[PDB]
Amino acid sequence: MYLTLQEWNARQRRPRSLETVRRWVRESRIFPPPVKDGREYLFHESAVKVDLN
DNA sequence: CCGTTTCGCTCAAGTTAGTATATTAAAGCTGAACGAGAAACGTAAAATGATATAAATATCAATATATTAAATTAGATTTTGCATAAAAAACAGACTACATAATACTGTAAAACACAACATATGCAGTCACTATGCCGAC
What we know:
GO terms for molecular function: DNA binding; identical protein binding. Part of the excision complex necessary for the excision of prophage from the host genome by site-specific recombination at the att site. Keywords: DNA recombination, DNA-binding, Viral genome excision. Interacts (via C-terminus) with the integrase (via N-terminus). Part of the excision complex made of the integrase tetramer, IHF, Fis and Xis. The chain has 53 residues and is of the alpha+beta class. It has one domain (1-53): Excisionase (Xis) protein (Multidrug-efflux Transporter Regulator, Chain: A, Domain 2), CATH 1.10.1660.20. The chain is 26% helix and 15% strand. It contains two helices and four strands; from the N terminus they run ααββββ. Strands 1-4 form a two-stranded antiparallel sheet. It has a two-stranded antiparallel sheet with strand order 2-3. It is globular. The structure holds one DNA strand of 139 nucleotides.
């Protein structure tokens, strides 16, 4: 039902580095926000990179 | 015959009189689309009606006499309806043997990300020009 960090970024237009994407998570730059499974984050299929300011 | 006024009528805004239901549950009605077998029809071919005349063949009464198909039995027998029961095969009721998954437990690489000092393009911060009629002023 959810999508892994890589499976979500791979679908993006400008696939950034893993670290950078992980940073948009701690900075709540992604809404709807992703949930932490065990060691990886599983975002939503409709989750988008909300760039504000 | 004619006009004028009262009266029968209907429109418009108040003043009263009367009666009281919603969901379940299960049908029932009817316009419209769907899917074969048997007999009346019809053109074509085969059998028959049409048609007549001297000669050939059948029409039939009344009774004697040899002949024969065949229903009428009458006894013989395959045929037909119905189980009984055991030989023979199917198949749960047991069980160890065998190969196979879910699980028990040790061994090892590596995914996934916080944490931390830099590095720096890029968006944001701050000011002037691009581009063209307002407003204000005359006509």
